[PDB]
């Protein structure tokens, strides 16, 4: 992982994360384990900060791009009020169906609008008309990393001024800091994409940011205008 | 408690932290280098999250326990509105005086009430105030680690419902996750103090928490009732 030791990571999770993690999330996280790409599920530690932030801002309307088996989606639904509404976009319905049973048992399916679609199409479609633009309290971008910069353009219209946009995987295995020659071939494409995204966000005068080493790296942005 | 490599840490600092850090904070950081215990100055990355949270909640009235040469104090002062008011407590005025010229250059001394006192004494005097309870938006506890549990008792009374209390050094050099036999003698007292503090915060029904590996570990709490 990103910390000095796996033991340190496990200490944080056991001490402060797992005891406060909803039972349904645990259940989903366990179901997820049987998936061949289980590693894609959102870090429970990153999730804990997402929850904290959602509650701090009393987020009610949110959007998630990249749902997979549903851990961040369920965490978000559990964090927001009973009347909260989430727009959840992914082109993989099969993966969503792995976490859906836990979303149902948790009593929060009513909060979720799952949109099975290419993400760019879905986001641009939402930006037609007036009911979506500037309406979201919080956005989570966790889909295909080479498209993050393009998603940022849309999220910065979808999320209201003063709202939050978070990007996952912004340290990409630590590889973004390493000399390129040390990096396995399979990691290079997203390494490049994430480096470019990080530079963009750090420079963007339209946001305040915090780039955190939680899970695989997560960056929270507040929209200034 | 830190990251897998110095390279990764320096990447985050240079890419996302230092370019957005206030000039006067850098100045203070440089002055701090001359103090024999300079290592006690707050991590700029933890600071960047502190600023983010402070702005997110529109904190105006804050309290800091453990000032040293002033990095977190100045960061807080720059984060809150012009009419913001900070109660800043430390028994070492000499260290405060190292940061004070930068606080003055920044034009924020007027926000700060520096109390040169034992921390528990200052907090208990504050609490004799008939209207002190629930008056603070944000507290930062960064003094002597064996007293963190007692400080929490006080901070839970001083900070408003929905307010935030943060504790620094909640991973104590990573030692909290190591068997005691692998830890230097001089680190053992605070290792145990922080282990117990973390257990207390994790189990406290009055708060929601997030325990983060930024700097030496920082835990943010939100008071629920
Ligand atoms: N162009 C695209 N449009 C929509 N979804 C996409 C996409 N490219 C990749 N994805 C989706 O992005 C997801 C990345 S993994 C998302 C992880 C999820 N947040 C969790 O907590 O489990 C995958 O489910 C994948 O199907
Ligand atoms: N019992 C006590 N009462 C008041 N201050 C105390 C104390 N024990 C330790 N301290 C103070 O706690 C501080 C810890 S270091 C504080 C670091 C500071 N937040 C920064 O960013 O620079 C020291 O300055 C020390 O003098
Ligand atoms: Ca992810
Ligand atoms: Ca002096
Ligand atoms: Ca400290």
| Phi, psi for residue B141 in degrees, rounded to 5 | -105, 115
- Put simply, the answer to whether B222 touches A56 (Cβ < 8 Å) is yes
CB of A208 within 8 Å of any CB in chain B? yes
Smallest CA–CA distance, residue B97 to chain A, in Å, is 29
**Among A195, A183, A180, which Cα is nearest to A146's?**
A195
Asked whether residue B144 is marked as a ligand-binding residue, the answer is: yes
Give the start-end residues of each E strand in chain B.
Answer: 61-65, 85-90, 112-116, 136-141, 159-168, 207-212, 218-223
Size of interface A-B (CB pairs under 8 A): 123
| Phi, psi for residue B222 in degrees, rounded to 5 | -115, 125
From the CB of A88, is ligand 1 less than 6 Å away? no
Torsional sign, CA B69, B75, B81, B87: negative
**Among A150, A12, A43, which Cα is nearest to B201's?**
A12
Residue A99 exposed, middle or buried by CB count within 10 Å (0-12, 13-18, 19+): buried
Start-end of H helices in A3-92: 6-12, 23-32, 44-56, 71-79
Expressed as residue numbers, the domain containing A154 is 1-225
Resolution (A): 1.4
- Put simply, the answer to whether A53 touches B56 (Cβ < 8 Å) is yes
Q: Is there a contact between A217 and B24 (Cβ–Cβ < 8 Å)?
A: no
CATH code for position A200: 3.40.50.150
Query: Which helix (H) or strand (E) element contains residue B103?
Result: helix B93-105
At A117, list the tokens: 């679609």
Count of domains for chain A = 1
The experimental method is X-ray
Q: Is there a contact between B25 and B47 (Cβ–Cβ < 8 Å)?
A: yes
How far is C-alpha A157 from the geometric centre of its chain's CA atoms? 18
How far is C-alpha B195 from the geometric centre of its chain's CA atoms? 18
Q: Is there a contact between B19 and A202 (Cβ–Cβ < 8 Å)?
A: yes
How far apart (Å, rounded) are the C-alpha atoms in residues B95 and B114? 12
Torsional sign, CA B104, B110, B116, B119: negative
At B41, list the tokens: 């100055």
Buried b (16+ CB within 10 A) or exposed e, A211-221: bbbbbbbbbbb
From the CB of A218, is ligand 1 less than 6 Å away? no
Q: How many helices (H) and strands (E) does chain B have?
A: 8, 7
How far apart (Å, rounded) are the C-alpha atoms in residues A205 and A211? 15
The pairing of strands A61-65 and B61-65 is unpaired
């Amino acid at each position: 992982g990103l910390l000095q030791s796996e033991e340190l990571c496990q200490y944080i999770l056991r001490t402060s994360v797992y005891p406060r993690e909803a039972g349904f999330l645990k259940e989903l996280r366990e179901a997820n384990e049987s998936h061949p790409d289980s590693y894609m599920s959102t870090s429970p530690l990153a999730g804990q900060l997402m929850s904290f932030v959602l509650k701090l801002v009393n987020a009610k309307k949110t959007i998630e791009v990249g749902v997979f088996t549903g851990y961040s989606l369920l965490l978000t639904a559990l964090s927001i009020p009973d009347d909260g509404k989430i727009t959840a976009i992914d082109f993989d319905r099969e993966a969503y169906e792995i976490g859906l049973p836990f979303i149902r048992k948790a009593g929060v399916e009513h909060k979720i609008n799952f949109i099975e679609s290419d993400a760019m199409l879905a986001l641009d479609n939402l930006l037609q008309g007036q009911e979506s633009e500037g309406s979201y309290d919080f956005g989570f971008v966790d889909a295909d990393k080479p498209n993050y910069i393009k998603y940022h353009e849309r999220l910065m219209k979808l999320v209201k001024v003063g709202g939050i946009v978070a990007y996952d995987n912004t340290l990409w295995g630590g590889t973004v800091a390493q000399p390129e020659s040390e990096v396995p071939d399979f990691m290079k494409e997203n390494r490049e994409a994430v480096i470019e995204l990080n530079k963009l966000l750090a420079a963007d005068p339209r946001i305040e940011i915090v780039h955190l080493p939680l899970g695989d790296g997560i960056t929270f942005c507040r929209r200034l205008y």
